[PDB]
Design a protein around this ligand. Structure first.
Ligand SMILES: CCCCCCCC/C=C\CCCCCCCC(=O)OC[C@H](COP(=O)(O)OCCN)OC(=O)CCCCCCC/C=C\CCCCCCCC
Ligand SMILES: CCCCCCCC/C=C\CCCCCCCC(=O)OC[C@H](COP(=O)(O)OCCN)OC(=O)CCCCCCC/C=C\CCCCCCCC
Ligand code: HEC
Ligand code: HEC
Ligand code: HEM
Ligand code: HEM
Ligand code: HEM
Ligand code: HEM
Ligand SMILES: CO/C=C(/C(=O)OC)c1ccccc1Oc1cc(Oc2ccccc2C#N)ncn1
Ligand SMILES: CO/C=C(/C(=O)OC)c1ccccc1Oc1cc(Oc2ccccc2C#N)ncn1
Ligand SMILES: CCCCCCCCO[C@@H]1O[C@H](CO)[C@@H](O)[C@H](O)[C@H]1O
Ligand SMILES: CCCCCCCCO[C@@H]1O[C@H](CO)[C@@H](O)[C@H](O)[C@H]1O
Ligand SMILES: CCCCCCCCO[C@@H]1O[C@H](CO)[C@@H](O)[C@H](O)[C@H]1O
Ligand SMILES: CCCCCCCCO[C@@H]1O[C@H](CO)[C@@H](O)[C@H](O)[C@H]1O
Ligand SMILES: CCCCCCCCO[C@@H]1O[C@H](CO)[C@@H](O)[C@H](O)[C@H]1O
Ligand code: FES
Lengths: 80, 147, 241, 380, 379, 241
């Protein structure tokens, strides 16, 4: 028994419609997408940064590794 | 009662008799003449036992202890100069060396070069360390018990 | 020292997620193996019966297996003995054990080809590049006796002499046996030997995607239909204020 | 007894109070879909596992081929093998997202649910570890060899514990047979402990994304979450199958298509993606003993999270500083994962030590510190 | 809550089932078998895992892997002994558990009773597939004899059987799946056992006088924790005495011979605990009837709850039922004996009599005598 | 073909629940096997190392194993080869396979003796009676060529010719090698080959019993001590009445 012992609530009214009287995915352009954009916007500069930073470190380290595999001509300039 | 039952069950998981039976091998030094390296099978991996001549043991002293990746003079490896016992596995990537051949008259790992001297020390090649020297000892002037 | 050349990506006809193997190419590839590679390379996991309905007829398969003598036994006196092959036999090993294999290839060991295209990075692109990539060592490099230079092999010195050359065999289906044609076919064959399920697996992927597309949309609607009640729900705070 | 038999019956009553009439927060997001996926994931591994077990032979001389026989002869053996092997990754992806969610929403404040969760993770790792050895390929054997030898570095009882575990002097047949037994067994322990996990969880009910009491707005698990979770199942199941069917070996090491050979060390002994991050931390500490501890700690660290919470709020929803620190950590883990797959050389060695060092700093020092700092910025 | 033994979500469970759990003050020794069965189960799983770590499920290595275990593994022989003989201790205990419930009308606790029947069916399947693993002569032939019975089911006959075998006969693909099943089932047993006890706790235990013991209940601990521990060592003595002084007393020597498909043993008979059913099997000459009779020999247990006519729960105060009860028990010793004998005269006729009286007593006499006794009490 | 003679129960010195094997008899029994039975009978599960500390010295064991050539291999060229035995080797098989065994024994197959005393009802009593029970067939009974009459063998016609006779060998420990003495010893040996744990198993039985006796008494007292409270409890019904 967990329903009926949860919280002491007073003076709140709620109105709801049967699922058959309404649409499943309403106002995709006027409400949905705008919000999706809103949500993306509000988070991008919190998530993206460290991932971008990770990428850079990855690129540097990968290139720096391949670069150390190449030969430096300055080791054979007097090997006549 | 508990202590015993637990002990018996615990020990059922340690090495079984057939396994212990291959724990250590005893080799007869008499079968190995000088100037000739012999390899036996110990723990599924090759086991080297070479009879070093008073001649080879000399080439050994003439080794810059501080010019080798795994700095160790014969002193630290063998026990009886005329006897070198190694684990026949390259320290690089697990291959098995070829005795007598190589730039340092010892062993040559045909996998990536790795040249080992008469003492089995990495000279020229990719291998980091020198062929491992497993536990052992001698028993009578003709028997050695590796393992 | 740590330098290595990576093979390119060839456009195999079986590379597309929905594209099967060209069984014509696989059939040829089998010939190459049978007449060339099978001389040193074992293929322990494939049996003649496996060819039936893939590259050969049941009659062709039965014929191919009979060309081989397999060791059966023991008999009445506990003796081993020979017999002609059945389609239940697996392709014949060229050597008894690896020791003998190496013994006959300069201490080198030609690996079993059953899973080779998966046991190597690059897969068929690697095997193809390797087979057609033999050439002379660049300046400063010396290949020890018994080894051949192949830039695609790690360390560049391989224990396998170039196995294939133009017209080294004739495709009984009338295809111009150029060296690259051969490698292309044998690689395709090897892809098949590593994974016979290949075509079925892809056919299954097609059904999985369609049903996946269908079922996901349907369940999205149902989830939405039910939640609609809470999504559009409205509330108000009406204290006796 | 009672009106409806869904409440009276001693069994249905259980099914009802946990999957039907169970009170759920009305606002839980998709991050709450991973528990059920983990449960389904587990039922599926056990299922495909048994189907593969019925054709497997635990013997060094038959393991590799028993698995090949299964793929090559058993009807859909290849499919089952794929699903089982790839299911292991689906399992871990799901578990890391499950753990993440809890870290970001302070679910760990549910101490017992959290601790049983860490146990589930440890058991899942041991399971996947011993399961990986069964095909007895090159990485199977060498991974087993590398990792188990680490413990001979424990003082005094080192070599003993290891040789005991191996049942001999090296990873050999007696190790394989006991690993099969363990691999068959542990998943059942996972199923059992999972029941405990949910039992403790039901004591409090679910936490939600705003981290405030949802007693004012609860909804029955069914149909809201039974549907949300089923949908969540197919959404994930698509990438899963797309991988297992269109790119079967994308995540596997080619080295494992070669029978184990004790006399041929592979050039790059590295784990499955889901262990890489730990492998990186392992190698960050040059010193056999320190590395092993560092390795152990990389996961045991999870038992300390409940004690390092300083914020006055439960989640990080309204904690911008903690949020970036959280994504730094996640990025930190991708870096370790990447380092774990690279050879031990410059620049990877130094980068490795930096990421390993920042990993522990962020969890032990920064998180609790920034948390306090944020309490001051709320005038608390 | 004051003490942490009640508040905690876990201890609370351990407390309400093994410590503060209300138990009848007058339950006898026949109530000691549930706990022994539980302990018996924990021990089989334990010794089973220890053996599994050295076993190899392959026709070419099964027999010798078991031999290797006995000959090389430290105390392998002890573990093998304990596991093998533990199977018998398990069945002895289970038959006494079942008997107790039939004699005291415990079956009126329908769900506890039905889950119990399921536990017994699962335990049998487990022991059956477990027996095949060593891959000796009786291992293979037993498997062969019994599994072939089902090809007698019309239509899905040869299908279901060939599916089960994974081929055309009991061969390697059977062994490997049987090992998986043998490893798996005990865990199902452990799980269902939890359900068994869960239903049981709904009512609490029944007692020997069959009347409400609410007037006199005592806490499980220390009364029954001690009584049960004592009952453990009392049984454990004969067990170990057998496994240590007469290791092969109950086993068939035929199993010390590697399975051979081209050599039928002269006498293919099961372990003692299956003999009674094997007897009923052979009693009906006709493949299909015998299989049904075999099945029914155990499934009959699901009907007991419906054949209770007495106005009293137990047979404590029902003398007529009491003798009928012991007739039944004797009936079963006879069937056990018949099962171990060749299929010849006089064994054949005796077999059909005992098989026939077995079902008569449970289906006809018990409910009839029960009604009769109700009249003699003027009810 | 119907009717069978059951061996009698001999008083073996290892029959008592607390009585071990006479290791002196076992050592001799080993000789019998080695010099007589091992000619046709395999004993796959016993190795020379097993004798050490039971019947032989480590030196004796090592010597005994070296008398044998075992097939090892492959070598460098993948060849099999011989080598002297180690104590880790198991007793040598007389034949490669059963077909060869039968071939050399008139299609009869002498079974491995490792578990024989447990693979036969009667055990050592049976094997002993069989070895010493050969005799002539009774009236009306004809034994087919190649078979010998033994009343103790089922069907009475066995494919094994009487294996032992007086002085067929000499016990190097100076024991009178009468036929029954030999059978007695070899049977004792076979008991040991079937279960090397025998003595340890019995020694454990002794400890089990003592601890069992002790522990059960103790627990009985404790059970009684606790229940004493309910056992002596007295009650009364006191209504207001
Ligand atoms: C560990 C092993 C390492 C393996 C690699 C790690 C996996 C890396 C994959 C990247 C994760 C992809 C998820 C990106 C989703 C981006 C996103 O939506 O973020 C924004 C969003 C905003 O939430 P609110 O503030 O509540 O909004 C309410 C008001 N509107 O944040 C979230 O969804 C919460 C974050 C939960 C998911 C975290 C998943 C990361 C997983 C890694 C494991 C990390 C933990 C440590 C484990 C140690 C072992
Ligand atoms: C089934 C498989 C067949 C295998 C063989 C069956 C085993 C045969 C062993 C014989 C059983 C030994 C027990 C003898 C004990 C004698 C004894 O004490 O009986 C008297 C005593 C008196 O009790 P009260 O009337 O309550 O007294 C209170 C007032 N003073 O009766 C009892 O103890 C109750 C009987 C319970 C034990 C029954 C055990 C028999 C077991 C066989 C299984 C039978 C059931 C059917 C199973 C089908 C599968
Ligand atoms: C004379 C025997 C011989 C022939 C014929 C031959 N190979 Fe090989 N092959 C070898 C040897 C030897 C090696 C070992 C190379 C090494 O490890 O140095 C080898 C190795 C290989 C490898 C690569 C090994 C690696 O580690 O990458 C592949 C793949 C291969 N062969 C393919 C083929 C194919 C395809 C053919 C037939 C077109 C073929 N071989 C024919 C001898 C042969
Ligand atoms: C010439 C080979 C030979 C010798 C030597 C020999 N046996 Fe046998 N033994 C056989 C044969 C053949 C059989 C098979 C008999 C049959 O199945 O008809 C046999 C069978 C047996 C059997 C009983 C088989 C059964 O089914 O009951 C035993 C036990 C046995 N031998 C014991 C011994 C012992 C002990 C010795 C040494 C004292 C010995 N044998 C020496 C050939 C031999
Ligand atoms: C086999 C693995 C596991 C299974 C099957 C599992 C299952 C579940 C399920 C079904 C829930 C409820 C649904 C949900 O909130 O997602 C849950 C919740 C939770 N689990 Fe797990 N879990 C597992 C591992 C873990 C791990 C590794 C942790 C963390 C170390 C953990 C921590 C939690 C916590 C704290 C909750 C509370 C969620 C909330 O905030 O409401 N679980 N788990
Ligand atoms: C928690 C669930 C499980 C996990 C995480 C898991 C994980 C794994 C992994 C990582 C592998 C190796 C995959 C590969 O071949 O590359 C494996 C193999 C295997 N697993 Fe599991 N497994 C699980 C449960 C089971 C169970 C319950 C069984 C059956 C009793 C089982 C039987 C096997 C068998 C037979 C193999 C070897 C065959 C093969 O390699 O595919 N697994 N498992
Ligand atoms: C693995 C097998 C089983 C386990 C572990 C098990 C365990 C238990 C336990 C611990 C109890 C409580 C103590 C007792 O009364 O003995 C119990 C009670 C009971 N069990 Fe079982 N049981 C098993 C099989 C069965 C079977 C086969 C039946 C009957 C077909 C059965 C019927 C009952 C009933 C009806 C009770 C009520 C006892 C009473 O009258 O108070 N059980 N069992
Ligand atoms: C309900 C518990 C169990 C029962 C009734 C049971 C019964 C049996 C039986 C009848 C045998 C044949 C005994 C013989 O050798 O003559 C057997 C063998 C075996 N059991 Fe179990 N078993 C149980 C649990 C387990 C479990 C959980 C495992 C381990 C996962 C297991 C593993 C084995 C193994 C490896 C063998 C083969 C080796 C041997 O024959 O000794 N058993 N079991
Ligand atoms: C048997 O080797 C199994 C491997 C595997 O990845 O299985 C999924 C493996 C393969 C190659 C190299 C190592 C391997 O094993 C492992 C095991 C491992 O275990 C841990 C993970 C987290 C924390 C502590 C440990 C330990 N020990 N961490 C990293 N790699
Ligand atoms: C694989 O054979 C296992 C045997 C065994 O006794 O295991 C413990 C066995 C050996 C020889 C002959 C038959 C054997 O199996 C069996 C199996 C058996 O199973 C049942 C028991 C009760 C009710 C129905 C069945 C069935 N089917 N009833 C009698 N013998
Ligand atoms: C092997 O043949 C396979 O049989 C399957 C049907 O079972 C088909 O779906 C596959 O396309 C086919 O390649
Ligand atoms: C998300 C649910 C995905 C279910 C996808 C079911 C598709 C499986 O379809 C499979 O296709 C194969 C190739 O034709 C056939 O051989 C199999 O018998 C068939 O079951
Ligand atoms: O029966 C008992 O019922 C209890 C109440 O559900 C559980 O907590 C116990 O685990 C179970 O054994
Ligand atoms: C008699 O030999 C016994 O063999 C046992 C092997 O299990 C040892 O544990 C005992 O110590 C030893 O006395
Ligand atoms: C009912 C409880 C019975 C417990 C009996 C414990 C006896 C086990 O005693 C055993 O005796 C063997 C022979 O001396 C030793 O080799 C073992 O190490 C020892 O544990
Ligand atoms: S393995 Fe020896 S040189 Fe590489």
């Amino acid at each position: 028994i967990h329903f009926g012992n949860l919280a002491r609530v007073r003076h709140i009214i709620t109105y709801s419609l049967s699922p058959f009287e309404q649409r499943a995915i309403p106002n995709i352009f006027s409400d949905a997408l705008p919000n999706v954009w809103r949500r993306f916007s509000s988070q991008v500069f919190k998530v993206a940064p460290p991932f971008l930073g990770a990428y850079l470190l990855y690129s540097w380290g990968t290139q720096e590794f391949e670069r150390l595999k190449r030969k430096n001509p300055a080791d054979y300039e007097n090997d006549q | 009662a508990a202590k015993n039952v637990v002990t018996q069950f615990i020990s059922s998981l340690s090495a079984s008799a057939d396994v212990l039976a291959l724990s250590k091998i005893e080799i007869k030094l008499s079968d190995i003449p000088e100037g000739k390296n012999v390899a036996f099978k110990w723990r599924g991996k090759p086991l080297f036992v070479r009879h070093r001549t008073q001649a080879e043991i000399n080439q050994e002293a003439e080794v810059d202890v501080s010019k080798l990746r795994d700095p160790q003079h014969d002193l630290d490896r063998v026990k009886k100069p005329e006897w070198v016992i190694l684990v026949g596995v390259c320290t690089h990537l697990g291959c098995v060396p070829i005795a007598n051949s190589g730039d340092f008259g010892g062993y040559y790992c045909p996998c990536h070069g790795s040249h080992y001297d008469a003492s089995g020390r990495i000279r020229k090649g990719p291998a980091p360390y020198n062929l491992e020297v497993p536990t052992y000892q001698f028993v009578g002037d003709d028997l050695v018990v590796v393992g | 020292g740590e330098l290595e050349l990576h093979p390119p990506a060839f456009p195999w006809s079986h590379g597309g997620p929905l594209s099967a193997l060209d069984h014509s190419s696989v059939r040829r590839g089998f010939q190459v193996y049978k007449q060339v590679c099978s001389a040193c390379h074992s293929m322990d996991y494939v049996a003649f019966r496996n060819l039936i309905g893939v590259t050969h007829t049941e009659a062709e398969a039965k014929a191919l297996a009979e060309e081989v003598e397999v060791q059966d036994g023991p008999d009445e006196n506990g003796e081993l003995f020979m017999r002609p092959g059945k389609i239940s036999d697996y392709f014949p090993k060229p050597y008894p054990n690896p020791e003998a294999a190496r013994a006959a290839n300069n201490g080198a060991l030609p690996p079993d080809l059953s899973y080779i295209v998966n046991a190597r990075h690059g897969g068929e692109d690697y095997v193809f590049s390797l087979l057609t990539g033999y050439c002379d060592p660049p300046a400063g490099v010396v290949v020890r006796e018994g080894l051949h230079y192949n830039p695609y092999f790690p360390g560049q010195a391989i224990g396998m002499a170039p196995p294939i050359y133009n017209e080294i065999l004739e495709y009984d289906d009338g295809t111009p046996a150029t060296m690259s044609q051969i490698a292309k076919d044998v690689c395709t064959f090897l892809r098949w030997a590593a994974e016979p399920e290949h075509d079925q697996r892809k056919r299954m992927g097609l059904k999985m995607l369609l049903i996946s597309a269908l079922l996901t949309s349907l369940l999205y609607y149902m989830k939405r239909h039910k939640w609609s009640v809470l999504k559009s729900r409205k509330m108000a705070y009406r204290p006796p204020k | 007894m009672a009106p409806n038999i869904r409440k009276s019956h001693p069994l249905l009553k259980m099914i009802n109070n946990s999957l039907i009439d169970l009170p759920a927060p009305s606002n839980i997001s998709a991050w709450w879909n991973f528990g059920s996926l983990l449960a389904v994931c587990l039922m599926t591994q056990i299922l495909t596992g048994l189907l593969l077990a019925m054709h497997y032979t635990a013997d060094t001389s038959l393991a590799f081929s028993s698995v090949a026989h299964t793929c090559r002869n058993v009807q859909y053996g290849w499919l089952i093998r794929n699903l089982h092997a790839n299911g292991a990754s689906f399992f871990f992806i799901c578990i890391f997202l499950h753990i993440g969610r809890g870290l970001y929403y302070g679910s760990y404040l549910y101490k017992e649910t959290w601790n049983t969760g860490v146990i589930l993770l440890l058991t899942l790792m041991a399971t996947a570890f011993v399961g990986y050895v069964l095909p007895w390929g090159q990485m199977s054997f060498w991974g087993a060899t590398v990792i188990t030898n680490l413990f001979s570095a424990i003082p005094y009882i080192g070599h003993t514990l290891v040789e005991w575990a191996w049942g001999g002097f090296s990873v050999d047949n007696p190790t394989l047979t006991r690993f099969f037994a363990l691999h068959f067994l542990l998943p059942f322990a996972i199923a059992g402990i999972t029941i405990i996990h949910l039992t403790f969880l039901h004591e409090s009910g679910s936490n939600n994304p705003l981290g405030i009491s949802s007693d004012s707005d609860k909804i029955p698990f069914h149909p809201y979450y039974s549907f949300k979770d089923i949908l969540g199942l197919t959404l994930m199941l698509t990438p899963f199958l797309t991988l297992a069917l269109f790119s079967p070996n994308l995540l596997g090491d080619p080295e494992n298509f070669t029978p184990a050979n004790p006399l041929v060390t592979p050039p790059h002994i590295k784990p499955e993606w889901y262990f890489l991050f730990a492998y990186a931390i392992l190698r960050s500490i040059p010193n056999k003993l320190g590395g092993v501890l560092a390795l152990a700690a990389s996961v045991l660290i999870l038992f300390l999270i409940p004690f390092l919470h300083k914020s006055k709020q439960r989640t990080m929803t309204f904690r911008p500083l903690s949020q970036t620190l959280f994504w730094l950590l996640v990025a930190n883990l991708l870096i370790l994962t990447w380092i774990g797959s690279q050879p031990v050389e410059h620049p990877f060695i130094i980068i490795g030590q930096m990421a390993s060092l920042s990993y522990f700093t962020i969890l032990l020092i920064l998180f609790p510190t920034i948390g306090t700092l944020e309490n001051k910025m709320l005038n608390y």
